[PDB]
Structure formats: C-alpha cells, structure tokens
C-alpha cells in the first residue's frame, strides 16, 4: 500500500528548509506510465541503525495508508543511501509562519477550528497506534486558511500490540515542546503528544510566540517541576486556557485525550467570540 | 472577562501553578546545535 519510488521518477527543484531531521525540497514527481505532480521531498539525514530504519518504514507504511482530511498522506518513499519521503506540496506553507505573517487575517473562528482539525488528525493517528513525537506549529501545514494538515519528518513511532510507551535512544529534540517525562526519561506516548498539542495551541493563540521566551532549554525541566507553565494568552478566556494547561499536568494519564479535546473545542467553535476575544473580530 | 490583565499587553515568560500537586513534581544535559557563533534553535542534544 506504500509506493516505492525510483530516483528517476522525481527531481528536487528547490530547497525549502533544513534542520536536525534533514532537508525539504520543492520537487516534481512523474509517476511511471504518465502527469507531473508538484511534491515536497523530505530527505532524512540521520545515519540510521537497522533499528532506526525498521522504525521509519513501519511508520511509513501507516502514513501511506492514511485517509483523513487533517493528515498528509505519504505518497511514496525512495530508499537509497538516504530515506526520502515524498508528499503533496503545500504552497501556503506551515501554520507557524502563517500566524506570524497574517495575524490580522485571523479570528476566533479560524483559531478554534485549527484546534479541532489538529485534534482530529492527532486522534486519527492515535487510532493507528502512531506516537507522532513532533507536534509543533512548525509542522502543521496550511492547505488553505480554513483547512490545515499534520505531517511527519520521519520521527513518528508505531507502537506494537501491547505497548503504551516508546523509549527513545537519544537525539536532537525540541525541548520546549516536549512533555517532562520525555526529557527526564525519553519516554514518548499518546499523552506526551497531548502535551505538545497544548504548546502547539499556545503558539496559535499567541500568533507565533516563542515559548518560554528567554529561558534556555537547559532550564526547562526544572521550571516545569516547580509548577511553572506557559502563560495565559492575551486573547484567551479562562475556559480555553485551562484546557491548554491540563495538557501539561505532570501525570500523563491525567491529561486530556484527543477525543475530549475534539468534543471540547468543537463546542467552543460554535460560539467563538465567547472564548477568544480578538480585536476587530467582534 | 477572564482575559488576563498584563501591563501593556506583555506576557511573562511563565506563570506558576504551584503549589498544585498536578503541576508540581512532588536535571539532564541539554546542548545547543551550533556550526558557527545556531543552525537550529528549536532542537537540542539530550544526553544523560
């Protein structure tokens, strides 16, 4: 069900970004007996163990099969000396950039619907037994300003039949998005994804602020243990903020579940002005 | 109306939920990624 692509089938037109994971390209895909399809091409550059490659693949089989409006399907994969994930291009780009650059074109309706859409997508993956491990606004993509999609850059994990946890080996990691148990113990679960959902949501409501701004990531585990958390966004009523905060409870199982997050944000989205007060959105 | 009052709209870096035992835990080695002078400020090395 997952398409294995030959290198001849596709070409990288442009660089779109780099990072720990590797590099993203603007690209063009020609399927074999054909149409040109504008695609993104993620080239993973971590020198993988066998353990690591097996894990990426398993994640890839799942992503290939996804059929949900709010998650990007893996269109194909090209394994050589490097893994390349091929995916439909989103020209609008990522949601972090959008809220920074187009703050003024964003009301309460847009924001709570984004919250629902991400929850739905994240719930879909949880039903697929996939720990995403990398939810941030830097990895939610805008199909269109009403419709947003979650993606992966190879870091997600499929949990086996009787597994609740994934224990990571050490790597380059987004400290300020991570749940505390992922930093102290490198443990990743659906509930640690919930934590990072909260942070994602904070970013949206603060129109792209840098979380824990001016506190070095080295100090994050401390301040969390002492009960410090991201502050209440200016536009947020208490009802919304308290939802975000519950995601950052110390006990992972006590946090909300994406199911509850959908139902909750969906109610709010039927009367947005009640729950987010944004200037000029009256 | 339950909106936070900040001086001139300015958020503090954090806000405390202490002494609530759900948020208070009742110190690993984090290193930046720097090729000259930070090619990525969101990710860090996490070691024991």
Contacts of B17 (CB under 8 A, 6+ apart): A227, A228, A229, A245, B23, B24
Contact A224 B43 (CB under 8 A): no
CATH of domain A1-89: 3.30.200.20
Report the phi/psi class of residue A192: left, alpha or beta, with left for phi > 0 and alpha for psi in -120 to 50.
alpha
Nearest CA among A232, A131, A228, A233 for reference residue A182 = A131
DSSP character at residue A276: B
Among the listed residues A84, A101, A76, A100, the one whose alpha carbon sits nearest the alpha carbon of residue A5: A76
Pairing of strands B29-33, A157-158: unpaired
Contact A64, A3 (CB under 8 A): yes
Give yes or no for a contact between A247 and A192, defined as CB atoms under 8 angstroms apart: no
Q: Within 13 Å of residue A13, how many CA atoms lie on the same side as its CB?
A: 10
Q: Could A172 and B18 be called an inter-chain contact, meaning their C-beta atoms sit closer than 8 Å?
A: no
Residue B24 touches chain A, beta carbons under 8 Å? yes
Query: Tokens 């442009």, residue?
Result: A14
Q: Report whether CATH 1.10.510.10 matches the domain A90-282.
A: yes
Question: Are the Cβ atoms of A245 and B11 closer than 8 angstroms?
Answer: no
Sequence ranges of the domains in chain A: 1-89, 90-282
Q: Which two tokens stand for residue A9?
A: 């089938």
End-to-end CA gap in chain A:
48
Of A215, A221, A250, the CB nearest to B28: A221
For chain A, how big is the Rg over CA atoms in Å?
19
- Residue B10: CB atoms within 10 A of its CB come to 8
DSSP E strand stretches across chain A: 3-4, 10-18, 22-29, 37-44, 74-79, 83-88, 130-131, 140-144, 147-150, 157-158, 166-167, 172-173, 187-188, 228-229
Q: Which helix (H) or strand (E) holds A35?
A: none
Candidates B16, B18, B46; nearest CB to A170: B46
Nearest-5° angle of CA A167, CA A172, CA A176?
A: 90
- The rounded Cα A218 to chain-centroid distance in angstroms is 23
B39 contact residues in A (CB cutoff 8 A): 18
């Amino acid at each position: 069900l997952l398409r294995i692509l030959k290198e001849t089938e596709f070409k990288k037109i442009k660089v779109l970004g780099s990072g720990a994971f590797g590099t993203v390209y603007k690209g063009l895909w020609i399927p074999e007996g054909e149409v040109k399809i504008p695609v993104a091409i993620k080239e993973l550059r971590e020198a993988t163990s066998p353990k690591a490659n097996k894990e990426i693949l398993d994640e890839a089989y799942v992503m290939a099969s996804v059929d949900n409006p709010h998650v990007c399907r893996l269109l194909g994969i090209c394994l050589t000396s490097t893994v390349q994930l091929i995916t439909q291009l989103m020209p609008f780009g990522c949601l972090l950039d959008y809220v920074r650059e187009h703050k003024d074109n964003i009301g309460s309706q847009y924001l709570l619907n984004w919250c629902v859409q991400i929850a739905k997508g994240m719930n879909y993956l949880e039903d697929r037994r996939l720990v995403h491990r990398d939810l941030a606004a830097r990895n939610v993509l805008v199909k269109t300003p009403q419709h947003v999609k979650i993606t992966d850059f190879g870091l997600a994990k499929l949990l086996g039949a009787e597994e609740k946890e994934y224990h990571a080996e050490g790597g380059k990691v987004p400290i300020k998005w991570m749940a505390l148990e992922s930093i102290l113990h490198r443990i990743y679960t659906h509930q640690s994804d919930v934590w990072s959902y909260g942070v994602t949501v904070w970013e949206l409501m603060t129109f792209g602020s840098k979380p824990y701004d001016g506190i070095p990531a080295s100090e994050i585990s401390s301040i969390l243990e002492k009960g410090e958390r991201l502050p209440q966004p200016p536009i947020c009523t208490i009802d919304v903020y308290m939802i975000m905060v519950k995601c950052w409870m110390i006990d992972a199982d006590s946090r909300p579940k994406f199911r509850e997050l959908i139902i909750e944000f969906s109610k709010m989205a039927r009367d947005p002005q009640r729950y987010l007060v944004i200037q000029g959105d009256e | 109306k339950s909106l936070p009052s900040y001086l001139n709209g300015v958020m503090p870096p954090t806000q405390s939920f202490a002494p609530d035992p759900k948020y208070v835990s009742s110190v690993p080695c984090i290193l930046p990624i720097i090729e000259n002078g930070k090619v990525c400020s969101t990710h860090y090395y996490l070691l024991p």
